[PDB]
Amino acid sequence: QLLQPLPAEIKGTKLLAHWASGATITCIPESFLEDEQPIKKTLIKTEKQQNVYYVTFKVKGRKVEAEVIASPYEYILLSPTDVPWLTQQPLQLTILVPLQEYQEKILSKTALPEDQKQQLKTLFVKYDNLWQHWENQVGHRKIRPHNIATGDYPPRPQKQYPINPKAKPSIQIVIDDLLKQGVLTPQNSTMNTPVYPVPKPDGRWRMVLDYREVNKTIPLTAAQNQHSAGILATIVRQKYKTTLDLANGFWAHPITPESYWLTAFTWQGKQYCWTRLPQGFLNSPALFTADVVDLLKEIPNVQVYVDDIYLSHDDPKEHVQQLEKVFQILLQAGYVVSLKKSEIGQKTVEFLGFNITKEGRGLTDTFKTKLLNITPPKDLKQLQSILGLLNFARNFIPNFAELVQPLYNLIASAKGKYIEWSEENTKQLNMVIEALNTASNLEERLPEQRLVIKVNTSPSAGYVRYYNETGKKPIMYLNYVFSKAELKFSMLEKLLTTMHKALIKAMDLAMGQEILVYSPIVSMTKIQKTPLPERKALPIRWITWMTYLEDPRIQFHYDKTLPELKHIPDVYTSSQSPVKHPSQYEGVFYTDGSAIKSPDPTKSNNAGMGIVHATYKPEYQVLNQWSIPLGNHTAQMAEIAAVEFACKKALKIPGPVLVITDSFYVAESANKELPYWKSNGFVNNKPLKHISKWKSIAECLSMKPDITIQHEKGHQPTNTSIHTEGNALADKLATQGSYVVN
Ligand SMILES: [Ca+2]
């Protein structure tokens, strides 16, 4: 548990002892007390009677004589009396995690009222032993050790190839910590497993075991929890939502001493074995999750997939009451929670087993059906991709040949491998999409025909088409938004996470009908054999992906007519179409800019912008004011540079903010022109200072998209809205700076 294990040898074989606090005598693993003769026989309430012995053993090299009983466990429960010299000391591993930055981060983003928010800040301390304090820290689970030695024909040992030495230092720490905790034991074995290193965003590296050779031997003989699909159907979305990431829980379940040889691996010419369940093993996710489910059975609403846990209660007070009940269970069992990726008491959770963020109160996940806009292609190869993409809608769209005709005429126009794109063509393309958004082309779902799903993906997002098996029109298209982590995935994994998000909505439309999925992938079996270093997603992703093949209701077919969508341009995402109230934003930024006639005839101009930071959470208040002269520039430039300053100051505040411009051109450009100027490369603006200002705004929004931009004329507004009052102050500051000369 929280006490550091102590190295000890009893009968030649090394073992570990744990300082106990109970007054009961020392327990010893059962396999050593068979040969020994019993002194007497006593019964224990917490009544079964067991034999009593008196054996000698070494603790840290010093022999110890004590009256002992048996223990079904693999550790030596050490009575404090028998060892008066040795004192209890807490566990001390290598690296201490930044636990205070984690808790302050969770307290910041919590959507709970300040009343319950202080209860949580108190719950950090009462259950301090529950959170993960050390890196690679694991907990002990007082459970009957698992037997994973199923199957009479053992697998063949794999030779260990040299690995990257740049990863050895960061991994040897983990080897030391697990050895220190007894998670790893030095022991030769018949089986050997390859080990692979993969980098971590912080610069260090984590090791990966290749257990697919042992999994082909071990048969599937365990009760599987509801899979990704079955869990997501029974969920209950209430007011607040909370997710708790465990610290590799399979490292908490110990395996039987007989099964240690199976999990063996070679590190630095030395062979080690696993005391606990290892990650990448066949039955580790199932054996671990089942235990977790029983504990969470008592809670009214819960869902557990792998490490992640889900809790959603509508009552603010009851969410915290159940949350404390969750913590006691996890602390009493010996589980360890990582506050690095945990999310507590938020209106939406970023990840709940599935990659989709969960908002609202809906038992079934909802997502936008309609396809999204596409940025103009920069090259011919990116324009040929989108044409062969729309080729499917020829057989059921009347105006198709008429609305696509202009784009065909544009390709042969230049004939110089460079293509010129007109702004109206961008609007024409937007019309092509709106035709698909119209429910005419949308066929109706038929409960008789099976559900056909055609899946392809672009570097920016995926494209999913739900069909009827005979129908020429699709029931409904589906376009999934890639998260910042999924964009890092390889192209093959972008398809798989796309299919994952597509089979979710298919369950709603299945209605007891088998589902056939067509995909550019030729063989599903070959995909499981895809090499490991090419997978750039978490194993939780692949397990979640592979668990869907086993369903006989779903079948996957290779489709040749699916085109290549690697050169598909970026999907146009609009953060301005949703409008949010100014009170819910954490920060409000009013901007403005003026430019009177310069006194000097040479400059001929003078500018001055104004910035106001306002917060509406408690009442209408202003944090700071700013009034800056900009020299000879455009009045709109003063209104252009006014938001570049405001965009930066929002980065220091992690939360929803809103910037407001008196200018029409600024807000409209940030909504439609900015997604263009990014891909446009700022071509044919405007000399160089003008372009640098727009890029800086684009990059600032790239680092934090939580920034929304509105626009309000505010011409002689007596008291139109409570919002225009703050903008009247910003225009005052912009005017003051415009009147000041250097
Ligand atoms: Ca202005």
Numbering used by the authors: 7 to 52, 56 to 694, 697 to 753
Any passages from the paper?
In an effort to further investigate the structure and maturation of retroviral Gag-Pol and Pol polyproteins, we have determined and report here the crystal structure of the wild-type full-length PFV PR-RT protein at 2.9 Å resolution. The same crystallization condition that yielded the crystals of the CSH mutant did not produce usable crystals of the WT protein; relatively fragile, but usable, crystals of WT protein could be produced by modifying the crystallization conditions. Both the CSH mutant and WT PFV PR-RT crystallize as monomers with one copy in the asymmetric unit in space group C2. In the WT PFV PR-RT structure, there is a calcium ion from the crystallization buffer (which contains 100 mM Ca2+) that is chelated by the side chains of residues D601, E648, and D671, which define the RNase H active site. These residues are positional equivalents of D443, E478, and D498 of HIV-1 RNase H. In the PFV PR-RT structure, the RNase H domain occupies the opposite side of the DNA-binding cleft, with the active site pointing away from the putative nucleic acid-binding cleft.
The mature PR-RT has all of the enzymatic functions of PR and RT [reviewed in]. The PR-RTs of FVs are monomeric in solution and the RT component is responsible for converting the (+) FV ssRNA genome into dsDNA for integration into the host chromosome. The arrangement of the subdomains of PFV RT is similar to that of the p51 subunit of HIV-1 RT while the PR structurally resembles a single subunit of the catalytically active HIV-1 PR dimer.
